[PDB]
């Protein structure tokens, strides 16, 4: 099948090269669907802060990245200050989301890539590939972090619901927890969130991703975390994947949005799992086994030499079935 | 001189030199009063973690200084990981309390310095000066940050209680809100906390120190924050101090513990207040006007030329009355 469409605006080199080489499908640049769909997920205050945060930082002759150095952690009140760094902490949970001169445009653009690829599936396609940089799954509704500024996968999922789908499901195969994606839908039952990550007991982001986070309110039952121990290989990982996909199918998801990080690779420096490039074909073949329209959204992965092979193996395997 | 100074082992140079020159009183090494009084404020889990942190970092060949890089901020669980770094971010609220080779012994030693000066007062001295480094008022019961690891002032406050007193009051004159001290006694009314500081809406620690934080439960009404705008001078600052001292006295404090920071100085690089060297004399007289036995605990104050002059002016003006 030469059917899946890739959307794109060193690392995207290897991915895009492998997309042509393995004949996944055509590549197209994004269209601009505006700020409204992003604001279906992110609060207006957060988007406004984000739009003007670097301009405000140049108003003080600030040199280098804009970065938070204080956070509203335990014993403190979760109350919004007015100074620029005070707010940056309010809207963040680590020092991993640095703001520079092009961060907003770059983040806005990634959400459009996701939304474009999203609209391909609405216009009849069975699958698409949103090659997003920066990634998004660590970003919550008004918290940024871990190189995530806007939650592309959550924005694409929300688009599917606003376009008439009763239920959809996010499957997050990134090595890290989708703490932002979890937080965004934590109390909803129209979006199921599954995630296979390194156990937050030892792994970033530490403070979400435990298996006993099932949702709150009406979203109880529709948050499913699969924390695995360091050293995990495909026998454990793929057994989590099997359980997760069965859950998605019993939830009667009408589309599945795949948060595709390939930093599970054994040669990835941030990884503590032991997946090999063959494992990614198998991950595509199992995801395809759900029989649903499937949107793949790029998340994490160090620009190793094999990032194109690892990521496009999922798409290859998907189209294999 | 009638006021003893306790000191351990670069600002201290200027301060001790000015304590000698102005004949403030003797200068004495601390004693070890043990872990128990530190533990009347801080959790044993926090004390064990902090004292073993450097050692675990060197057991995993840690490169340099030990610092957190993730925090249980908004949308995250305040739940403790097992990872060294996850634990560290759980026990902190910012990146400004690093842990290196000598750190827990240095923090332990400041608490001991504070306890020795507290002890001089219990034995019949009207005042004493704890020349603590590192400072303490940003540390809560089990949160660290702002170069504060153990809350010196709060440990000495509680010692006064454990040694007989019904009621004590803490006066935090540092330019910054003493968030950890407000936290430690927030639902208590035998310990009245007051603080004058740059409005947290723009000044660190950002997320505590608003005027509407009056206390919790039976601590309701026993926590008095005086946030001030940037550019404040003695007409405003002395007004807060005059109201705070009135209210300490209305409280029947038997001992007042002053968390003494001099980073309110106009020439201090961190300050957004405009206090002058003679202002610290007026400050000392006004505290002494309260009529109470008074323990002075060093906090902030960048190592400018005048730090010794300013700090010792509060003690001089105290002894003038
Ligand atoms: Cl990531
Ligand atoms: K982003
Ligand atoms: K994941
Ligand atoms: K949900
Ligand atoms: K204090
Ligand atoms: K203060
Ligand atoms: K109190
Ligand atoms: Zn990742
Ligand atoms: Zn200070």
Author numbering:
A (entry chain A): -2 to 6, 31 to 342
B (entry chain B): -1 to 7, 31 to 342
What does the paper say about this structure?
Classical Zn2+-dependent deac(et)ylases play fundamental regulatory roles in life and are well characterized in eukaryotes regarding their structures, substrates and physiological roles. Structurally, these enzymes are composed of a central eight-stranded parallel β-sheet flanked by α-helices on each site, known as the α/β-arginase/deacetylase fold. All active site residues were conserved, as shown by the multiple sequence alignment and the structural alignment, suggesting a general acid/base catalytic mechanism for the bacterial enzymes as described for the eukaryotic counterparts. These enzymes mediate catalysis using a penta-coordinated catalytic Zn2+ ion coordinated by two aspartates and a histidine (KpHdaH (1b): Asp181, Asp269, His183).
To explain the molecular basis for classical deacylases to act as polyamine deacetylases, we structurally characterized the enzyme PsApaH. The crystal structure of PsApaH confirmed the analytical SEC experiments supporting cluster 4 enzymes forming head-to-head dimers. Dimer formation is mediated by a structural feature distinct to polyamine deacetylases, i.e. L2-loop (PSL: polyamine-specificity loop). An important specificity-determining interaction is a salt bridge between R95 of the L2-loop of one monomer and D163 of the other monomer of the dimer. The N-terminal L1-loop interacts in trans with the L2-loop, occluding the active site and thereby restricting the access of acetylated peptides. This L1-loop is highly flexible in the apo form, as it was not resolved in our apo structure of PsApaH. In our PsApaH structure, Y168 exists in two alternative conformations supporting the flexibility in the unliganded state. In PsApaH, this Glu106 is replaced by His106 explaining the higher acetylpolyamine substrate promiscuity for PsApaH. PsApaH and the P. aeruginosa enzymes PA1409 and PA0321 also contain the PIS-motif, which explains the higher level of promiscuity observed for bacterial polyamine deacetylases. Notably, the bacterial polyamine deacetylases also contain a conserved RPP-motif (PsApaH (4)/M. ramosa ApaH: 154-RPPGHH-159) and an XGGY-motif (PsApaH (4)/M. ramosa ApaH: 320-EGGY−323), identified for robust deacetylases such as KpHdaH (1b) but not present in deacylases with activity for longer acyl-chains, suggesting these enzymes prefer to remove acetyl-groups from polyamines but no longer acyl-chains. Only the cluster 4 enzyme ApaH from Pseudomonas sp., PsApaH, showed activity as polyamine deacetylase.
